[PDB]
Design an enzyme around this catalytic site. Structure first.
Site, PDB file in Angstrom:
ATOM      1  N   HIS B  46     -20.876  29.182 -61.215  1.00 57.93           N
ATOM      2  CA  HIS B  46     -19.445  29.167 -61.503  1.00 57.93           C
ATOM      3  C   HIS B  46     -18.699  28.075 -60.788  1.00 57.93           C
ATOM      4  CE1 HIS B  46     -18.152  31.945 -58.029  1.00 57.93           C
ATOM      5  NE2 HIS B  46     -17.265  30.982 -57.985  1.00 57.93           N
ATOM      6  N   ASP B  97     -25.046  33.858 -61.932  1.00 54.01           N
ATOM      7  CA  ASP B  97     -24.210  32.979 -61.156  1.00 54.01           C
ATOM      8  C   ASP B  97     -25.060  32.384 -60.020  1.00 54.01           C
ATOM      9  OD1 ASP B  97     -21.928  31.665 -60.504  1.00 54.01           O
ATOM     10  OD2 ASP B  97     -20.965  33.356 -59.605  1.00 54.01           O
ATOM     11  N   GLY B 196     -13.222  30.269 -52.297  1.00 51.48           N
ATOM     12  CA  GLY B 196     -13.765  29.197 -51.461  1.00 51.48           C
ATOM     13  C   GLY B 196     -15.038  29.578 -50.767  1.00 51.48           C
ATOM     14  N   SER B 198     -17.354  31.291 -52.439  1.00 56.31           N
ATOM     15  CA  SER B 198     -18.410  31.412 -53.446  1.00 56.31           C
ATOM     16  C   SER B 198     -19.554  30.432 -53.189  1.00 56.31           C
ATOM     17  CB  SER B 198     -17.832  31.103 -54.839  1.00 56.31           C
ATOM     18  OG  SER B 198     -16.719  31.894 -55.200  1.00 56.31           O
TER      19      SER B 198
END
Ligand SMILES: *Cc1cc(C*)cc(C*)c1
Ligand SMILES: [Cl-]
Ligand SMILES: [Cl-]
Lengths: 17, 245
Positions: B46, B97, B196, B198
Site C-alpha cells: 500500500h 499488503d 507513517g 506502515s
C-alpha cells in the site's frame, strides 16, 4: 486535501477514501 | 507510534526508512520496512501502489532521525520493487499488503551489519507466537491520530497478539480480518501504530529468536478501543518471499 508529498497516504489514520 | 518511547536505531537495527524523491528533487518519507537479508527490505504494498516506479525510492538503514542524517546510516537505491499482484484494499482492510525492495548502494553493494544495521529473521512457515505474547513495533509515524507533523526521532512501543476469535468480533474487525493477517494491541488501548508506521516491523521473540512476525498494514484509527493494529502475517508468505528473493 492531501498532496503527492503525503507520508504513507494509505496508512491507518489517513484521509484516503 | 502512539505512546511508547523514543528509541534509537541500535535497538531496532533491522528498521528501514523508505523515502520518495519528487519532480523537483525534494524527498519525503514514505513508509517503514525491515531488513530481512543484506540485499532485501520487506514492507507493505500500500505504501507504493500509487507510485510503483522503483527509481523514485531511497532506502536508509541505520537511521534514527526522519529529516536529519545520523551517524552510522547507509543509503541505498532500489534495484527491484516487488509488489503483491493480489493487493486489494476494501474501505478498511488491505489484503496482500506486502512488498519487497532489493537494495543496492551507488557503489553496487548491499547492506553490511554493524552496530546500527542488522537483519531480522523470518518465522518458519505458519509459526506465530501464542496469543497474548508481547511484541514490538517501531516507526516514524504520527504520535497522535490528529497530528499533522511526524516525530523526528524514531519511536518503538509494545503491543500484544490478540486472537482472530477476539479480533473477529463485530465490535472489533469481524471477517475484515483474513488468516493472512495478525492483530496486535495494547491491553489498555493506549499505544499503537499510526499513519507513517506502515510497512514497519512487528517483532516478536519466537522460539528464542527475534522474528518479523508482522508488517504494519492497517486499522481503524490509531489506539482506539476494540480496534487493534492489523499486520500482514509473515508466516503465511514465505513462498512468495522465497520465489521473489
Ligand atoms: C490524497 C491521497 C493520496 C494518496 C496516496 C492516496 C489517497 C487515497 C489519497
Ligand atoms: Cl519537488
Ligand atoms: Cl506478486
Amino acid at each position: 486535501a492531501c498532496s503527492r508529498y503525503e507520508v504513507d497516504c494509505r496508512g491507518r489514520x489517513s484521509a484516503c477514501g | 507510534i502512539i505512546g511508547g518511547e523514543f528509541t534509537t536505531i541500535e535497538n531496532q537495527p533491522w528498521f528501514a526508512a523508505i523515502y520518495r524523491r519528487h519532480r523537483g528533487g525534494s524527498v519525503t518519507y514514505v513508509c517503514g520496512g525491515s531488513l530481512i537479508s543484506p540485499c532485501w527490505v520487506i514492507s507493505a504494498t500500500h505504501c507504493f501502489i500509487d507510485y510503483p516506479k522503483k527509481e523514485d525510492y531511497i532506502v536508509y538503514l541505520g537511521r534514527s532521525r526522519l529529516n536529519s542524517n545520523t551517524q552510522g546510516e547507509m543509503k541505498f537505491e532500489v534495484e527491484n520493487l516487488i509488489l503483491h499482484k493480489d493487493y486489494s484494499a476494501d474501505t478498511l482492510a488491505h489484503h496482500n499488503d506486502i512488498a519487497l525492495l532489493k537494495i543496492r548502494s551507488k557503489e553496487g553493494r548491499c547492506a553490511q551489519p554493524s552496530r546500527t544495521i542488522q537483519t531480522i529473521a523470518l518465522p518458519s512457515m505458519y509459526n506465530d507466537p501464542q496469543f497474548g505474547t508481547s511484541c514490538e513495533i517501531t516507526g516514524f509515524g504520527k504520535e497522535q491520530s490528529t497530528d499533522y507533523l511526524y516525530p523526528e526521532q524514531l519511536k518503538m512501543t509494545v503491543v500484544k497478539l490478540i486472537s482472530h476469535r477476539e479480533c473477529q468480533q463485530p465490535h472489533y474487525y469481524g471477517s475484515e480480518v483474513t488468516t493472512k493477517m495478525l492483530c496486535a494491541a495494547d491491553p489498555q488501548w493506549k499505544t499503537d501504530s499510526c499513519q507513517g508506521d506502515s510497512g514497519g516491523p512487528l517483532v516478536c521473540s519466537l522460539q528464542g529468536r527475534m522474528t518479523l512476525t508482522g508488517i504494519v498494514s492497517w486499522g481503524r484509527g490509531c489506539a482506539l478501543k476494540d480496534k487493534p493494529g492489523v499486520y500482514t502475517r509473515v508466516s503465511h508468505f514465505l513462498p512468495w518471499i522465497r520465489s521473489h528473493t
